[PDB]
Amino acid sequence: LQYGPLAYILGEKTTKKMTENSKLITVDGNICSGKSKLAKEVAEKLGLKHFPEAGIHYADSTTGDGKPLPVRFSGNCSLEKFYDDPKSNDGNSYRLQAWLYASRLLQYADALEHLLSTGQGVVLERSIYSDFVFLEAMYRQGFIRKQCVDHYNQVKKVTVCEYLPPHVVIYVDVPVSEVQSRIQKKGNPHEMKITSAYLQDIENVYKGTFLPEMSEKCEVLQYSAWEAEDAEKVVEDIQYLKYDKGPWLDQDDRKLHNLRMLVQDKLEVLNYTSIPVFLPEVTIGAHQSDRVFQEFTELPGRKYRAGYNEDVGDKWIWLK
Amino acid sequence: KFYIQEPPHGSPNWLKVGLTLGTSAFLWIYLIKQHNEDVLEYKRRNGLE
Amino acid sequence: MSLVYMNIMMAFTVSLTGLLMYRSHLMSSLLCLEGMMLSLFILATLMILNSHFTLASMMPIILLVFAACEAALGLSLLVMVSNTYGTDYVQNLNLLQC
Amino acid sequence: MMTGRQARAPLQFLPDEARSLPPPKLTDPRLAYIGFLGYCSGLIDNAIRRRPVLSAGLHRQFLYITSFVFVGYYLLKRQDYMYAVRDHDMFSYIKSHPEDFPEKDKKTYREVFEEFHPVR
Amino acid sequence: MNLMITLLTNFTLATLLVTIAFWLPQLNVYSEKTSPDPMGSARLPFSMKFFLVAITFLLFDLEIALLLPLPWASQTTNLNTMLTMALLLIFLLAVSLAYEWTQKGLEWTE
Amino acid sequence: LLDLIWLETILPKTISLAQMKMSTTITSQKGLIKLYFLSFLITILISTTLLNFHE
Amino acid sequence: MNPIILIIILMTVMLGTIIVMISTHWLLIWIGFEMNMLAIIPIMMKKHNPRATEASTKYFLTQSTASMLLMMAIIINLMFSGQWTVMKLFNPMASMLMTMALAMKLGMAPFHFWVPEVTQGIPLSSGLILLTWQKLAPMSVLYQILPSINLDLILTLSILSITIGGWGGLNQTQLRKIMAYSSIAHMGWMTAVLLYNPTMTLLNLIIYIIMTSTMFTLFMANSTTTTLSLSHTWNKAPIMTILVLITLLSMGGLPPLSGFMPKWMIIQEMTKNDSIILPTLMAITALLNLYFYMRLTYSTALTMFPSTNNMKMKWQFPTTKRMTLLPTMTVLSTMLLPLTPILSILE
Amino acid sequence: YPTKETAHWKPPPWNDVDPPKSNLTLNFGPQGVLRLVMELSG
Amino acid sequence: AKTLLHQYWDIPEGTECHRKTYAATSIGGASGLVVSAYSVALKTPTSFLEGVARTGRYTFTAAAIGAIFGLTSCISAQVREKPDDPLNYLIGGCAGGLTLGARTRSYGIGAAACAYMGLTAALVKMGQLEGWKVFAEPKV
Numbered sequence A: 001l002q003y004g005p006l007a008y009i010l011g012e013k014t015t016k017k018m019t020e021n022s023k024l025i026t027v028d029g030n031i032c033s034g035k036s037k038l039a040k041e042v043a044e045k046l047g048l049k050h051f052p053e054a055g056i057h058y059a060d061s062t063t064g065d066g067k068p069l070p071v072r073f074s075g076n077c078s079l080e081k082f083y084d085d086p087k088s089n090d091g092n093s094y095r096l097q098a099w100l101y102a103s104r105l106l107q108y109a110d111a112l113e114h115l116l117s118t119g120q121g122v123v124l125e126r127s128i129y130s131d132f133v134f135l136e137a138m139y140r141q142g143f144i145r146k147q148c149v150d151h152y153n154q155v156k157k158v159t160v161c162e163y164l165p166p167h168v169v170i171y172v173d174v175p176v177s178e179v180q181s182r183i184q185k186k187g188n189p190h191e192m193k194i195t196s197a198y199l200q201d202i203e204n205v206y207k208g209t210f211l212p213e214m215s216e217k218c219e220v221l222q223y224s225a226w227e228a229e230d231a232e233k234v235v236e237d238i239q240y241l242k243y244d245k246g247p248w249l250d251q252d253d254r255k256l257h258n259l260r261m262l263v264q265d266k267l268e269v270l271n272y273t274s275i276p277v278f279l280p281e282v283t284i285g286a287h288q289s290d291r292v293f294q295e296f297t298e299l300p301g302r303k304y305r306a307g308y309n310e311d312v313g314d315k316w317i318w319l320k
Numbered sequence B: 001k002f003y004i005q006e007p008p009h010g011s012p013n014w015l016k017v018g019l020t021l022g023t024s025a026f027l028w029i030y031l032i033k034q035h036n037e038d039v040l041e042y043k044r045r046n047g048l049e
Numbered sequence C: 001m002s003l004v005y006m007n008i009m010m011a012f013t014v015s016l017t018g019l020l021m022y023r024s025h026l027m028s029s030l031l032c033l034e035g036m037m038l039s040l041f042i043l044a045t046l047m048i049l050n051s052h053f054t055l056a057s058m059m060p061i062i063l064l065v066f067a068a069c070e071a072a073l074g075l076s077l078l079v080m081v082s083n084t085y086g087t088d089y090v091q092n093l094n095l096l097q098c
Numbered sequence D: 001m002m003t004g005r006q007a008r009a010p011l012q013f014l015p016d017e018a019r020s021l022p023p024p025k026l027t028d029p030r031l032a033y034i035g036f037l038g039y040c041s042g043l044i045d046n047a048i049r050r051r052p053v054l055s056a057g058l059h060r061q062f063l064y065i066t067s068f069v070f071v072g073y074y075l076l077k078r079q080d081y082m083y084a085v086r087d088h089d090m091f092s093y094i095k096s097h098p099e100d101f102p103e104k105d106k107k108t109y110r111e112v113f114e115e116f117h118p119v120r
Numbered sequence E: 001m002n003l004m005i006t007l008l009t010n011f012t013l014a015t016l017l018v019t020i021a022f023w024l025p026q027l028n029v030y031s032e033k034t035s036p037d038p039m040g041s042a043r044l045p046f047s048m049k050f051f052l053v054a055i056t057f058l059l060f061d062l063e064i065a066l067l068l069p070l071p072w073a074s075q076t077t078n079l080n081t082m083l084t085m086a087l088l089l090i091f092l093l094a095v096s097l098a099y100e101w102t103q104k105g106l107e108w109t110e
Numbered sequence F: 001l002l003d004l005i006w007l008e009t010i011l012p013k014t015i016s017l018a019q020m021k022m023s024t025t026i027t028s029q030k031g032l033i034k035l036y037f038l039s040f041l042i043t044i045l046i047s048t049t050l051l052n053f054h055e
Numbered sequence G: 001m002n003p004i005i006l007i008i009i010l011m012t013v014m015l016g017t018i019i020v021m022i023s024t025h026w027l028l029i030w031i032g033f034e035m036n037m038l039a040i041i042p043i044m045m046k047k048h049n050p051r052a053t054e055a056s057t058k059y060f061l062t063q064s065t066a067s068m069l070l071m072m073a074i075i076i077n078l079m080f081s082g083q084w085t086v087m088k089l090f091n092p093m094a095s096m097l098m099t100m101a102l103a104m105k106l107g108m109a110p111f112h113f114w115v116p117e118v119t120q121g122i123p124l125s126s127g128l129i130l131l132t133w134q135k136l137a138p139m140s141v142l143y144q145i146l147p148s149i150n151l152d153l154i155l156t157l158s159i160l161s162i163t164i165g166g167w168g169g170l171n172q173t174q175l176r177k178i179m180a181y182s183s184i185a186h187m188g189w190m191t192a193v194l195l196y197n198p199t200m201t202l203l204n205l206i207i208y209i210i211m212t213s214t215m216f217t218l219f220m221a222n223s224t225t226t227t228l229s230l231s232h233t234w235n236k237a238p239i240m241t242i243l244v245l246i247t248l249l250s251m252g253g254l255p256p257l258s259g260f261m262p263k264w265m266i267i268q269e270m271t272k273n274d275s276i277i278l279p280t281l282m283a284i285t286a287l288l289n290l291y292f293y294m295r296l297t298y299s300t301a302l303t304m305f306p307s308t309n310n311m312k313m314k315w316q317f318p319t320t321k322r323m324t325l326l327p328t329m330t331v332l333s334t335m336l337l338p339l340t341p342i343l344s345i346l347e
Numbered sequence H: 001y002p003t004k005e006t007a008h009w010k011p012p013p014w015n016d017v018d019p020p021k022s023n024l025t026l027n028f029g030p031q032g033v034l035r036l037v038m039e040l041s042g
Numbered sequence I: 001a002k003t004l005l006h007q008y009w010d011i012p013e014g015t016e017c018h019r020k021t022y023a024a025t026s027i028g029g030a031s032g033l034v035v036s037a038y039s040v041a042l043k044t045p046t047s048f049l050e051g052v053a054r055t056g057r058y059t060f061t062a063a064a065i066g067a068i069f070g071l072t073s074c075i076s077a078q079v080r081e082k083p084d085d086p087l088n089y090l091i092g093g094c095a096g097g098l099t100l101g102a103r104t105r106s107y108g109i110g111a112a113a114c115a116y117m118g119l120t121a122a123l124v125k126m127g128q129l130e131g132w133k134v135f136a137e138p139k140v
Ligand SMILES: Nc1ncnc2c1ncn2[C@@H]1O[C@H](COP(=O)(O)O)[C@@H](O)[C@H]1O
Pocket: A030, A031, A032, A033, A034, A035, A036, A053, A054, A055, A079, A097, A100, A134, A135
């Protein structure tokens, strides 16, 4: 372990690198809001690091070779099957949503660690504070049950409460007809199978639940469809902001050091994600878990720790 | 290389390895010297000379 | 021994029977703790002053100061309850049973 | 139960008279068992951190074995000194007071009566 | 017993004064006041700084009582040990004051 | 009658039933500190008078 | 949680305990006790949640009542003796008050009512500290007062503590309450033997300290607080399941493990003084302890409980926690039996 | 081992954090003359 | 309540029924009072009347257990002309178990209480005869 309390004793203070440009900015929107490139523009305007949307193989990408692991080893859920049958028997919907929330939590932990260590601000898309707007859009469409909803609420309550919200959020306002037309012109062979009621529900939860609390707990900006293209207006608006809200104001060196200690233990971040609540859409019995665990242990680069694999070509294993 | 990020345990910590080797050698020679001194004092005390 | 000694013992037993079977909030418990404080202080001072042990006059004052700081700690604990439940009642202390 | 013995020289792990005993050899079976315990501790430390058990941390395993064998040697020395004190005090108090320890006349079997209970 | 005589006389004079101030004007037949503060209906806020400075006063007074017996102690034979002890105790008071300064104690009630 | 019911009833099941019953009686506290301190008072009074542990 | 402040607080706890150990005056014993509890109060307020405040309030009230009883015993001893050496007391009331004061301090039943609650509401490091290091000082106090200890009172407290701890641990499913009741039962077990041979008491204290430290280290390493997550841990590291299985086997005194070392030898000092029914009764209650231990290992490793889906991400990250002294304390808690006469160093 | 008395004991929260379950307002009287409605935070 | 045990054991077995009966009744009453006091302290009573009802129920039940056990042991020791026999205490313990089962409105509980109380009284006689010491003074 490199960073510890000994470093903080020796003078590794995290507000030494906390300049005025170290800002946590997340951008939101609809299914095909076109924000995906816009944040990239911010990555070439304020110099901030940008992170893509947390996919299924994001945890596969961050460690090991970074290659996409097969869906049996990680996820066991596919977006194409969700677009095919949302009310399926095996419960692809809630399993996919729980896996994506876990991946987004891992992405937010990595983003917070990078911001706290390197001192450089970070731009994200659809952070963990804007994921339930998907799940509620499932429940109002009947895609899941009530037990899944309260289990997700318990998971969010035990996971979010140890973290701080981002500095500025940006929501791109794209209506339902524009979203459906953009999906039609995009050309994905499986993306038209969702009803427009799902996009309407996403927009309704966005403008009914997300904005009334992100107008209070953090800084909020709102833009229409065409105003998202004008990058200079957006960066001038975010660079001329007066931060008075949010708990980022009352952060001393001790609290940020504790946060840095907590986000550098990836087991500690995801310890409360998979609580022992037995909901038949996410629990898997002993036989399949044992089989897939023994198969994952046979994968190259994963049988031992990252510095102790002979089959991938690590030398001086006997002197460590 | 195989791992995209460099692992913290990728390279052997040579300072810690040398410290472990030196500590083992020092403790071994200290134990041997202590045993030799104690057995010499024992044979001088009880006259098994 | 002397009758004042037995009066101090009876006072300490009164503070003991008041400290255990309370009905009110934690302030009553801390007040009975201060009763124990005062009884022990008076008994130690009477013993030291009656037997002419000159050095053990260090005993009474010290016998206050340490636990006095401990008493201050108890006050902070009550403030924590006053920052959590509004009132410092002992009937609100039923969250750890389950 | 030796509260009156070590009180003359308190906080002494190994006193001077402990040097009068034969010290235990470096090939003591208990000492080798403690070295085996150190090797097992090294194996457990390699196993719990997801490392190759029989290859990784050879210097770590040697340090574990060396530290365990050192503390085992010193603890064995203290144990031998304590039991030497115990039976020396036993023999000394037996020698000093032979009125409470009479010499029993060990009678032969030619006249002592043993009751016999037949089995059938 | 003269000290207790003075205390009893003084307490009884105070009792006489409060009896004159409380029961002597009751002879008059002026009126009965039915009488049907900024505090409307809210609970009393727990301003934590007052409690903090009160317990800080308590700790400082306790070790002031520790610091007390120097005028009697100044006639002792071992003056060097006394000087070291007194200087180190006042240094402990300075260190506790410095800590109470640093950890946001003397802010918003300076 | 015997090797599946009565022999199962005499030694192990009566013991297990008594164990679980008195365990449920022991761990059925309400978490109130006042009751604990009242039980402390009763214990102290019993030890001082009804047992005479200080002779 | 300033590291300088945490280091200073831990040094204050160590200084208070060692002041209880090395002093020759009753006032310094009480000084060490007071400074120890005063500096251990912030350890149980590490996480800043109301349950910790509840637990620390109950702990402070019980420890302060015990300390006031301790001064009652000291002042009575001063009245009847006129001297302050830490040795046998000179009054039966002093011995009685001191005995239940130390029983209140150590969580001995029926004064145990704070132990399963407080340990439920504090973080696992604070629980380890309270169940491991706090028990050391009043053991020294009880060891230095053994000529004047009344036999009936300490025997009644011991048997009541063992029985109550076993029967209370028979029902709880939380790990911390099971640990608390196990600590109560072990406390009664090693206070039953004190008046006959205190070397057995010191040996059982060291063995219990090592074994409880191993258990708490494993619980902080697996980040598990209840039975269900401890069941779920078998997807993450099966070697940790094997380790918790073998040290829970050792925890119930099953040979050839280390936990069979003290209690059996405690029986070796029961029949010397012509007592036969007592080790049998405490052995039956140790069997109750082994029953809920066996329940814990059945839930943990000897079966394969159904897991969730997110374990896969937990299979992509090794344990980054500072697993300190886990292998040494695991080996010393399982394979120490052929080195039984090492207890001679505790004389 | 659930009984009637302990049938209402919920499982504890997984993070072991209790849920958390304002400001002063003053009405200064008119006793120039001014009536101030005053909001305080200490 | 230590000298009460001595007064119970001062009367020889199977000689005078009355004083053994009152000694066993007082022992049972004391035990029931301790159990009732601990039950009231730990389990909060609904009111004063229900609390003293539970206290009286426990006290009278335990006093009846003691009186029945002592009376039955004494009449069995008289009818066997053998004070030094554990059979009399076994019969008295079974009578106490039967009375406890009748009080608790049960019969299997009564039979189990017969067996266990008879074995316990037999072991009490065993300790009285052979000098078993469960609270042994430190000898070595
Ligand atoms: N409930 C959901 N249904 C479909 N896609 C989702 C859901 N939640 C998150 N996503 C992700 O969000 C992406 C859409 O964002 P984008 O197409 O980048 O604007 C999808 O391709 C998924 O990776």
